[PDB]
Write a protein that binds this ligand. Sequence first.
Ligand SMILES: CCCCCCCCCCCCCCCC(=O)O
Ligand SMILES: [Mg+2]
Ligand SMILES: [Zn+2]
Length: 630
Amino acid sequence: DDLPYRFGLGKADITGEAAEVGMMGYSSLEQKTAGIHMRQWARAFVIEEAASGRRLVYVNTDLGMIFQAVHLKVLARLKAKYPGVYDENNVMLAATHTHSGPGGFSHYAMYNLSVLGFQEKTFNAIVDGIVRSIERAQARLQPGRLFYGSGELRNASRNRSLLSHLKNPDIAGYEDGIDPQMSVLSFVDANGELAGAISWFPVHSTSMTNANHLISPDNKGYASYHWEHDVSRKSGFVAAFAQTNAGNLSPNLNLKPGSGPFDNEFDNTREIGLRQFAKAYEIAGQAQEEVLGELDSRFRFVDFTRLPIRPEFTDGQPRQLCTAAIGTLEEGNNPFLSALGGLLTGVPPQELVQCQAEKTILADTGNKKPYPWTPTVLPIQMFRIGQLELLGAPAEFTVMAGVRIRRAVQAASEAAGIRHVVFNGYANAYASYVTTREEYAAQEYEGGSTLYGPWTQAAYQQLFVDMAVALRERLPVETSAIAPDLSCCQMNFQTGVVADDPYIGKSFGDVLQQPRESYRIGDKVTVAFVTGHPKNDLRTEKTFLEVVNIGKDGKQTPVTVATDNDWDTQYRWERVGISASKATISWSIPPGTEPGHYYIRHYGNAKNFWTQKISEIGGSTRSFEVLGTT
Ligand SMILES: CCCCCCCCCCCCCCCC(=O)O
Ligand SMILES: [Mg+2]
Ligand SMILES: [Zn+2]
């Protein structure tokens, strides 16, 4: 015949600087990276219509957000290497909204504030890994089928701003403040075995708190890892856990037996990840509806400055968006904030005060010079995948802000044969929060980070409906406005690596703490090595550590059984004295590990003060025995 689509699945490492960079999400000057729990990945899904095609690519990333700077550079790189294949119309980048990665990868000052500015090494790793994930995906194209399903996930999330949610007049089906809908797009190969999947479900990826310093992809990242590493059987499975409208949704409390909820953020991350995984796996297993039909897409950069909004989307009067403002730790420090001005002096312009409505302005970000602290030109994008439409929206939408847009788009698209509309927030840029008009009036946290005023949600609804109508009628969307390039003029106040020295009387790679003679399943092995600063080399597609199996004995050929990516391992870096440092590596030995002999290897990099040369360093522990059974 035969198969309606081809798809390609790819994954690549986008982990940034693992020590001494402010983390992105919690806005803390006292949350710097200090190691890795699990790495961050870009997971790319290339889809081609056999009829056609007509190729689309969707990439979900283990990041707090995908900033405009990343989107622009990724597109340029794709156009340079693969001319005519990819552009803004057929590439969607989205983020899981983990709050446990290194920051500094926006070009807008607001989002770099707590990080003390732009961190080029982390930015570059993100861009490069997103591109590598697409390269890997497109090199693995195969014929297959696509299925769609949905279901209700009850106990994974909770509304964190319920007072505002309840101000909406239209909350039937959302009376608990939760959007319980999970949607799954499954990728079924010519065998039809499940080759990969994308799950969409809204919940903040904040199980690892602002007290944590280890890099982690958080609860959605655990869901992906559990599917790829613990569950599939097949290689190489790619499972993305993506967001929808999560602006006002937090992980539910973890009240599983024997746990306080509070007691252990790793347990919480695993539990909330597992709750999402279990539902995604259930839905995929149902293969509810085969996806059939054309691939299509639209994309527009929209200038938000004085954007007119038609009365059909507002209270019934014509409206216009406001320039950006935030409503009501630097301190202290913050030299980057100081280089920006920093906070004050208002009163802001009267026109701004007036049209921001119930907001009490804390910072007038839109009027900052030479550059606004927040974006002004924002991407709006939609993919059609058979009877599915997937929307990529550049912000955090509350449940009702997203639901209203979904409803409006489904109404506009029904005649085109669309039956399911999936709203993917955190896509292509990041412009803070979107609350409905009613929520905005309450001015809880999400209101007050709704930058463009009370009609921000109405603007997005208009933009998406107009795009849906263009798709329906065939026909282009309006010409894109011109996304500002701020690459020239990025500031940074985060110091780098001066140099590394080994511990006095030792060499890089020397073992500081050897493992015990023997351990049992369930025990944690902790070892430590003289190291150098992880800012020297991200060890992209490699590792800071290996757990190595050498057999029952002997004497057997070494086989790596765990890397720094794995849930069961941790890598921690800490400064010792002026220029020395230690790498502490742990392994929690999981059920099912073979009894036998093991050791731990460390890989790192060190910088010479005099030459500035960066070299490879490393070491291996003595062996230890895991005791048990089979
Ligand atoms: C107000 C909207 C109409 C104006 C749009 C400007 C037309 C130029 C766009 C050309 C790019 C091709 C757009 C996709 C068209 C299609 O495939 O249906
Ligand atoms: Mg690990
Ligand atoms: Zn958020």
